Design a protein around this ligand. Structure first.
Ligand SMILES: *[C@@H]1O[C@H](CO)[C@@H](O[C@@H]2O[C@H](CO)[C@@H](O[C@@H]3O[C@H](CO)[C@@H](O)[C@H](O)[C@@H]3O)[C@H](O)[C@H]2NC(C)=O)[C@H](O)[C@H]1NC(C)=O
Lengths: 50, 48, 160
């Protein structure tokens, strides 16, 4: 998001590339919240073995 | 007066004694380095 | 003074508010001269830095606050989250300073960066203190989002 904006001038509105990067950031952050909920609902701390 | 090989020439010189301001560097180099060396001392309290 | 359409103007982050013309007599070594001045009132628009440094840093310090939802026995996970947050807070402090010139005094953007940095550093030392105690997580689970929420009401009202 930083290295995509510097090719543009310092305009005061959001372009379509910014609206792509924002939604992609929302999905990545939602994957983080997904892991947060999964880790909160984790009981035993070991894993599994054959 | 300065002296060259062609003769002696008059000279005026205007000079300034600039002093650098410490405030920018003390928050963008010195303080990050101090806090980063603070962060390394967190390791000494963690279990081995 | 005749301005134009005020839209072909390449003023991007600013916006011409108005103009005022004045005249005065200055005194120099040679003599007194009539000086004519035109003042151009320009007011800035932050929409650019919101996506440059504000939102970006706010989402990093939101990612700082999810460490509390991770269990206390997962030590390398939470310390990896901590070290990544603090190194990227330093990185975003460095990057946002490139747009600013080399001035000595502090700005409101630098004050926001410093408040976010001390917030994430407080989060890391709180997790560290919890780890040394078990060898208050829920207590922070409310306090650390709320302290930034009251800060943003303090920060934006006082500067706007
Ligand atoms: C910045 O640097 C310059 C150059 O180093 C400094 O200029 C120097 O100033 C001193 C005194 O102001 C000069 O000394 C003079 O020497 C003559 C010799 O006959 C003497 O008659 C005078 O009474 C005086 O003592 C020195 O010559 C001069 N350097 C040069 C190369 O001309 C300057 O002071 C420094 N600081 C500032 C704030 O500019």
């Amino acid at each position: 998001s930083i290295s995509a904006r510097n090719s543009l001038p310092k305009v005061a509105y959001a372009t379509a590339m910014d609206w792509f990067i924002a939604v992609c950031y929302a999905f990545v952050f939602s994957a983080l919240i997904e892991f947060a909920t999964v880790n909160y609902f984790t009981k035993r701390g070991y894993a599994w073995d054959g | 007066k300065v002296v060259f090989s062609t003769g002696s020439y008059p000279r005026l010189s205007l000079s300034f004694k600039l002093k650098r301001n410490i405030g920018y560097f003390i928050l963008q180099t010195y303080m990050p380095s101090i806090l980063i060396t603070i962060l390394s001392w967190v390791s000494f309290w963690i279990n081995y | 003074v005749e301005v134009g359409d005020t839209r072909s103007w390449r003023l991007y982050q600013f916006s011409f508010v108005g103009l005022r013309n004045t005249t005065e007599v200055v005194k120099t070594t040679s003599g007194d001269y009539v000086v004519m001045s035109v003042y151009f009132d320009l007011s800035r628009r932050m929409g650019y830095f919101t996506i440059q440094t504000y939102i970006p840093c706010t989402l990093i310090v939101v990612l700082s606050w999810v460490s509390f939802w991770i269990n206390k026995d997962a030590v390398p996970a939470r310390t990896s989250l901590g070290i990544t947050t603090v190194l990227t807070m330093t990185t975003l402090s460095t990057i946002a300073r490139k747009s600013l010139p080399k001035v000595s005094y502090v700005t409101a953007m630098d004050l926001f960066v410093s408040v976010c940095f001390i917030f994430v550093f407080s989060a890391l030392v709180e997790y560290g203190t919890l780890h040394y105690f078990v060898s208050m997580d829920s207590y922070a689970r409310i306090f650390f989002p709320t302290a930034f929420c009251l800060f943003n009401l303090v920060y934006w009202v006082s500067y706007l």
